[PDB]
Paper text:
The pneumococcal serine-rich repeat protein (PsrP) is an important lung-specific virulence factor that is present in 60% of strains capable of causing pneumonia in children. Pneumococcal PsrP promotes both biofilm formation through self-oligomerization and adherence to keratin 10 (KRT10)-expressing lung epithelial cells.
BR187–385 crystallized in two crystal forms of the space groups P43212 and P4122, with differing unit cell parameters. Single anomalous dispersion (SAD) data, collected from a seleno-methionine derivative of the P43212 crystal form that diffracted to 2.25 Å, was used to solve the phase problem. Three BR187–385 polypeptide chains were placed in the asymmetric unit, and refined to R- and Rfree-values of 18.6% and 21.5%, respectively. Crystal packing analysis revealed that two symmetry-related molecules in the P4122 crystal formed an intermolecular β-sheet resulting in an interface area of 585 Å2. The same interface was also observed for chains B and C in the P43212 crystal form.
Numbering used by the authors: 204 to 377
């Protein structure tokens, strides 16, 4: 008898340049041995599956989905171990991988973790309904599997303007 539990979190912010919604999705699966995290930033509204406005973003515009050490992405409860590397890739509308980027190194900053700059997405993809996706695992060693995740998106120049604020924290207790 294998058992697992999955939560999907979604939220929304504002791209300052194009004045459009920008969205994130975070899927977290707990199978008893580890938490698997999948984090996607996209212009496709997860509620409707409709792509945002309006064709008028240039192809070489580009965004990151992780801050560097401008901000902590992830904090972990007492019975979660060290996160793996963070795989980075572009996903299509159905979440299947289109191409892959360098795997990032998860490091500690502050009370939690970040990974640093690695992948980006450019209008040439955002406009196809694609997302910029990162995934990693964290071992479970006991009962306190709480965590918080803070989403991030910014154009590759000007790393300081997080499109999500970033006051849109995901907080899971235990």
């Amino acid at each position: 008898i294998a058992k697992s539990e999955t939560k999907v979190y979604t939220g929304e912010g504002v791209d300052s340049v194009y004045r459009v919604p920008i969205y994130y999705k975070l899927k977290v699966t707990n199978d008893g041995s580890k938490l698997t995290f999948t984090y996607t930033v996209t212009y496709v509204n997860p509620k409707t599956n409709d792509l945002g406005n309006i064709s008028s973003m240039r192809p070489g515009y580009s965004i990151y989905n992780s801050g560097t050490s401008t901000q902590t992405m992830l904090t972990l409860g007492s019975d979660l171990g060290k996160p793996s590397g963070v795989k980075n890739y572009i996903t299509d509308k159905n979440g299947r991988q289109v191409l892959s980027y360098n795997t990032s190194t998860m490091t500690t900053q502050g009370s939690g973790y970040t990974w640093g700059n690695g992948a980006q997405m450019n209008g040439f993809f955002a406009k196809k309904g694609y997302g910029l996706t990162s995934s990693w695992t964290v071992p479970i060693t006991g009962t306190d599997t709480s965590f918080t995740f803070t989403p991030y998106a910014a154009r590759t120049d000007r790393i300081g303007i997080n499109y999500f604020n970033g006051g849109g924290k995901v907080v899971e207790s235990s």
